């Protein structure tokens, strides 16, 4: 682990303007940010970008996004969020990460943290 | 009434960094903003200031802040919060069952008085 999302706070709904808070640990430093957006996850990514921009890290483009649940159904069902990223700033450098969580918003966050660590991972050798 | 706070939502607590959203109406246009702060009301003022600067209006300095309740009040008690602004000193009061909302009322009253000096 090179980057850890210590905590996040996501808020939306009919009547609410989507906004989110982020707390991440990268290179011994803790970064805290807020932002609004068109949706909960979107606001989160906007907040991330502020930290990300300051660090000279560019986030891979979101190419596809899919959320599924294992058989059995439920309102409290665990969520599989698949996100397709393109590493290239353009060209094809496509790859996928996943999150599993009771909360789907958190699952997308998980899948983003996995993406971040894959791209900031020191060379395997 | 020249300015209206159409809506706001303030969120704070232990483990939470204070932040607020503001939606205000002024001269036909609606302005929406967000901001963090040291406290809920403080986060609200930071957000308000962002709009305030855009519109070219300067907010008076907070000289004092007092929150009181009428006799025998439970936890659901109505709150009278009076804020004094800056001689050039004046006060605004808000009354509401929610204490942070009563400070928003007091700030809204100040904004309307400051934009209409003739009272
Ligand atoms: C990828 C789309 C995301 C999930 C959506 N716009 C949201 O913020 O809720
Ligand atoms: C004037 C003090 C205010 C109420 C406090 N800093 C708060 O935002 O909670
Ligand atoms: Zn919130």
Swiss-Prot record, chain A:
Briefly describe its induction: Expression is repressed by isoleucine but not by leucine.
Give the domain of life.
Bacteria
Where exactly are the transmembrane stretches of this chain?
Answer: none
Q: What is known of its domains?
A: Contains a catalytic N-terminal domain and a C-terminal regulatory domain, linked together by a flexible region. The catalytic domain consists of a TIM barrel flanked by an extended C-terminal region. The active site is located at the center of the TIM barrel near the C-terminal ends of the beta-strands and is composed of conserved residues of the beta-strands of one subunit and the C-terminal region of the other.
Family affiliation: Belongs to the alpha-IPM synthase/homocitrate synthase family.
Functional description taken from the UniProt entry: Catalyzes the condensation of pyruvate and acetyl-coenzyme A to form (R)-citramalate. Shows strict substrate specificity for pyruvate. Cannot use alpha-ketoisovalerate, alpha-ketobutyrate, alpha-ketoisocaproate, alpha-ketoglutarate or glyoxylate.
Give the quaternary structure.
Homodimer.
Q: What is this protein called?
A: (R)-citramalate synthase CimA
Organism encoding this protein: Leptospira interrogans serogroup Icterohaemorrhagiae serovar Lai (strain 56601)
Tell me what gene encodes this.
cimA
Swiss-Prot record, chain B:
> Which region is the signal sequence?
none
Name the consequence of residue 99 to A: 1.6-fold decrease in Km for acetyl-CoA and 2.8-fold decrease in kcat
* Outcome reported for the amino acid change (mutating residue 41 to L): No change in Km for acetyl-CoA and 2.3-fold decrease in kcat. Severely impairs inhibition by isoleucine
What induces it, per record?
Expression is repressed by isoleucine but not by leucine.
Cite the record's note on assembly. Homodimer.
UniProt remark on domains: Contains a catalytic N-terminal domain and a C-terminal regulatory domain, linked together by a flexible region. The catalytic domain consists of a TIM barrel flanked by an extended C-terminal region. The active site is located at the center of the TIM barrel near the C-terminal ends of the beta-strands and is composed of conserved residues of the beta-strands of one subunit and the C-terminal region of the other.
**Family as reported in the entry's similarity comment:** Belongs to the alpha-IPM synthase/homocitrate synthase family.
What is the protein's known function? Catalyzes the condensation of pyruvate and acetyl-coenzyme A to form (R)-citramalate. Shows strict substrate specificity for pyruvate. Cannot use alpha-ketoisovalerate, alpha-ketobutyrate, alpha-ketoisocaproate, alpha-ketoglutarate or glyoxylate.
What protein name is recorded for this chain?
(R)-citramalate synthase CimA
Which stretch of the intact protein is present? 390 to 515 of 516
């Amino acid at each position: 682990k090179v980057l850890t999302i210590k905590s996040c706070n996501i808020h939306s709904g009919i009547g609410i303007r989507p906004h989110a808070q982020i707390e991440l640990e990268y290179q011994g430093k803790i970064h805290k940010e807020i932002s609004e957006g068109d949706g909960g996850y979107d606001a989160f990514m906007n907040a991330l970008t502020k930290i990300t921009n300051r660090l000279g890290i560019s986030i891979p483009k979101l190419i596809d996004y899919e959320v599924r649940i294992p058989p059995g159904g439920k309102t409290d069902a665990l969520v599989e969020t698949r996100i397709t990223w393109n590493k290239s700033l353009d060209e094809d450098q496509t790859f996928k990460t996943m999150g599993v969580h009771p909360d789907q918003t958190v699952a997308a966050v998980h899948a983003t943290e996995k993406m971040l660590n894959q791209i900031l991972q020191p060379w395997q050798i």
